[PDB]
Amino acid sequence: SVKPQLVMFTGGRDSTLAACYLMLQGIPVHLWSGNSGCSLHRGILSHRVEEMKNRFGDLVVGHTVADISGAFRSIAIEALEQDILKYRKNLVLLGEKLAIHAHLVDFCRRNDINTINDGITHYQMEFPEQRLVAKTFLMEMMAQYDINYQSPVYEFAQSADDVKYRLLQLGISTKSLEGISIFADSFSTPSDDVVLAYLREKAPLAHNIVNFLAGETLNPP
């Protein structure tokens, strides 16, 4: 049998497609959803999980909903004032993606997973966590823990229509069946330099969270 991989899953179109495409290849998927504690109307997600189980059966090996609110708070919210004053951009959703990755190190090590997959896309590159500089940074971070971070729909998705009509071909809804962050439409577009600087500044906190989650320290960075 083929080793299960993890998919960072929102119920949105792109992460649904990434999971489906792996399953089409015979790769079992563990769906993993991060609840940051600032996400609204997540109930529709269960409709999407049912669609995926109906289409792929046992290749959906599980769905973990993880509470990442504390890590998210430590990285992105506790120093929000200072962060916004320094970078002049609201980067909390970049912080969220880093909090996700910290939690994923711990999850992967405790559940014998070493490939993680997301649904970032080329056409969404205005979003900081989907920029090449962020993806490269997070690939490097995961590689330090021997975790392979892949983005299987990144290059294919030149528009939302590309993702939608592949889903439709699988007999799955084209709608985005996800919760929304309260931070939706709460930010302007940051430069690549700012994205990378924020990631570098917060990285010590992220690694520290990894170490705490592993039971290796209580002390701060």
Ligand X SMILES: Nc1ncnc2c1ncn2[C@@H]1O[C@H](COP(=O)(O)OP(=O)(O)OP(=O)(O)O)[C@@H](O)[C@H]1O
Residues that bind ligand GTP (CB under 6 A): 93, 124, 127-129, 160, 164, 174-176, 178, 180, 184-185
Residue partners of 47: CB distance under 8 A and separation at least 6: 173, 177
Site string for ligand X, 102-141 (x = CB under 6 A): ----------------xxx---x-----------------
Contacted entry of a second copy, ligand GTP, ligand X, none for residue 219, CB cut-off 5 to 8 Å set by kind? a second copy
Contacted entry of a second copy, ligand X, ligand GTP, none for residue 93, CB cut-off 5 to 8 Å set by kind? ligand GTP
- Binding test (CB under 5 A) with Mg ion, winner from 7, 12, 83, 205: 12
Residue partners of 180: CB distance under 8 A and separation at least 6: 39, 40, 41
Q: Exposed (0-12), middle (13-18) or buried (19+): which is 158, by Cβ within 10 Å?
A: exposed
- Binding test (CB under 8 A) with a second copy, winner from 2, 3, 44, 204: 44
Q: How far apart are CA 26 and CA 145, in angstroms?
A: 26
Distances (CA, A) of 47 to 42, 153, 163, 172: 10, 22, 18, 11
Q: How far apart are CA 132 and CA 148, in angstroms?
A: 16
Residue partners of 149: CB distance under 8 A and separation at least 6: 101, 115, 116, 117, 118, 138, 139, 142, 143
| Site for a second copy contains 221 (CB under 8 A) | no
Whether 134 and 195 have beta carbons less than 8 Å apart is answered as yes
Nearer to ligand X, 39 or 208 (CB): 39
Q: How far apart are CA 35 and CA 33, in angstroms?
A: 6
Minimum separation from the CB atom of position 153 to ligand X (A): 8
Minimum separation from the CB atom of position 183 to ligand GTP (A): 7
Binding site for ligand X (CB under 6 A): 8-10, 12-15, 33-34, 36, 100, 118-120, 124, 176, 178
Binding site for a second copy (CB under 8 A): 21-26, 37-41, 43-44, 47, 66-74, 77-82, 84-85, 88-90, 152-153, 156, 161-162, 165-178, 180, 182-188, 209, 212-216, 218-220
